[PDB]
Curated annotation (Swiss-Prot), chain B:
Keywords: DNA-binding, Repeat, Transcription, Transcription regulation. It comes from the Archaea. General factor that plays a role in the activation of archaeal genes transcribed by RNA polymerase. Binds specifically to the TATA box promoter element which lies close to the position of transcription initiation. One of its GO terms (molecular function) is DNA binding. HAMAP family: TATA_bind_prot_arch. GO terms for biological process: DNA-templated transcription initiation. It holds the Pfam family TBP. This is TATA-box-binding protein. It comes from Methanocaldococcus jannaschii (strain ATCC 43067 / DSM 2661 / JAL-1 / JCM 10045 / NBRC 100440). Gene3D superfamilies: TATA-Binding Protein. InterPro entries: TBP, TBP_archaea, TBP_CS, TBP_dom_sf. Sequence repeats lie at residues 4-80, 95-171. The keyword Transmembrane helix does not apply.
UniProtKB/Swiss-Prot annotation, chain C:
The gene is tbp. Belongs to the TBP family. Disulfide bonds: none annotated. This is TATA-box-binding protein. Pfam families: TBP. GO terms for molecular function: DNA binding; DNA-binding transcription factor activity; general transcription initiation factor activity. HAMAP family: TATA_bind_prot_arch.
């Protein structure tokens, strides 16, 4: 009946007008094909994250379990580039773009009843698992599974995750 | 390329509905006034469910189309009217939601998309498929590794096509 | 404080390998090829490459109107054009009011990446790295933010500016 | 067109754990409000330069016409603190952090032309005088006025100011 943040998506900027051809030589597991895509994708083994680095120096990062874990990943790559003589932003702003939270309702819900009794939900066991439920405040998408597991996506903060859960729990309560 | 798999519809069938009597009239009707104030009636063929309130409000799920829902509703209304309940004979049926499906034709790289397209969420350990929430039109899109796309929150088949176009354009752009 | 977008610069592509000398025949006004519209009041610079640059629009949508209107003219004269081309914001000017009149000498000493020299230019110049913008701060408290690619970035820029200036006064 | 340096911003470190209360006791024109702001401000009249001094020993100095002028001012302050019995480094290295350079194009530029034809420029005469032009090498901000006056900021060296001027001139030439 409590929020667990399980993954975050973060944006940052680690430099300006970066030479991606040089970056691709420095970094490990760096995929760079300028004829096919503009960005460079770096998949870190430790921590287990993927980073997309643009010539502008903007970076998108997926896979981290938390902001702090994304921060380690980002700063590890900043150090690699700095050490190789790239001009970097050494303590970048790490902005949360998305958070994914889980909770367990503690009961196995009847998704057919929810789908019929709660407005703005959909459910089609043949097409996808679980029930989809969009909230307007906070602006999230909620997935509720037969196990009682709940997944909240689109979140901007842990506080919003808490607000989301209250609303979910209060709506399910009638049912 | 858009196929509608289910609809959710609403209607208004009357004003002062005695749910206890409705429960006597309809087969397989779930009514427990203390727990929830609405009556549930589930049909097996078609696999369609109605929720009926004392206010006369009706919600309906499980139908493949608005027309199939309308047939379900009309049948139930006739049972109630014949028993003596004051109901509206031809109520207006309003689409509240849909599940629409499409195929990309390719097996997409969801990792790339989650990395490359802002406003998407992909966490395969939680849920298969990428979640892509839109505002114009206001829909939730799920994209699967197979290339299957499910579009939910729709109010019409034409918003589905707007949604699908924006999806395809974004994954290109 | 609220941000006002005062101008945008947008780029697009209306095709490839345009013959500019024959474009000046179709579009009234054409000094690549410079074209000036009255409604909306915008200017467009078209290269043979197909690239278009546009200044003067209040918004992306105003620019979109001007580009679409000149596309529809080129189309009819037999030039091969893209009808709904992707338009991209290249720059903006955003303005805000701090809500206080700042001490520009205080900021120039106490905040790094600022310069101030009233005899050469009015206002204090403040460079940010993320978002990568140039900010002009005036004694009136008025700020001008340039180098922007989005309104979200203008919001992010102002938050950082206000926060740094709160630390000064 | 020739570069004139009009001002410099310099930094240095004058010691390790400087007692700012005692610095305020001896520097005339010293502003120190530790509850409001951690640094001490000293504003010199001759020459018109200002210093910001931190407990870390970090010093930032604005107003000087040159690095040397700034160093002279800093050493005068150091002598007072040394004379006062405050532990200071007597031979600090003065680092240029910023400079304002000016030049004259020799022509009265058509700023509207430049705003259209040169990328990374902005011009909004109702909001500010001059056209704003950012360079990435050297990393500077340039303001160009209808008079032909050019101001270059963000400079780390006089040599970089010259390199900036060549690029500005080359750009205007193409317009």
């Amino acid at each position: 009946p409590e929020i667990k943040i399980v993954n975050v998506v973060v944006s940052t900027k680690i430099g300006d007008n970066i030479d991606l051809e040089e970056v691709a030589m420095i970094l490990e597991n760096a995929e760079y094909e300028p004829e096919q895509f503009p960005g460079l994708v770096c998949r870190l083994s430790v921590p287990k994250v993927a980073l997309l680095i643009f010539r502008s120096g903007k970076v998108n990062c997926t896979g981290a379990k938390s902001k702090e874990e994304a921060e380690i990943a980002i700063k590890k790559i900043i150090k690699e580039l700095k050490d190789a003589g790239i001009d970097v932003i050494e303590n970048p702003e790490i902005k949360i773009q998305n958070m994914v939270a889980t909770a367990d309702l503690g009961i196995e819900p009847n998704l057919d009843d929810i789908a019929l009794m709660v407005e703005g939900t959909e459910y089609e066991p043949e097409q996808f698992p679980g029930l989809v439920y969009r909230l307007d405040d906070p602006k999230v998408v909620v997935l509720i599974f037969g196990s009682g597991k709940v997944v909240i996506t689109g979140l901007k903060s842990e506080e919003d995750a808490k607000r989301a859960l209250k609303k979910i729990l209060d709506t399910i309560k009638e049912v």
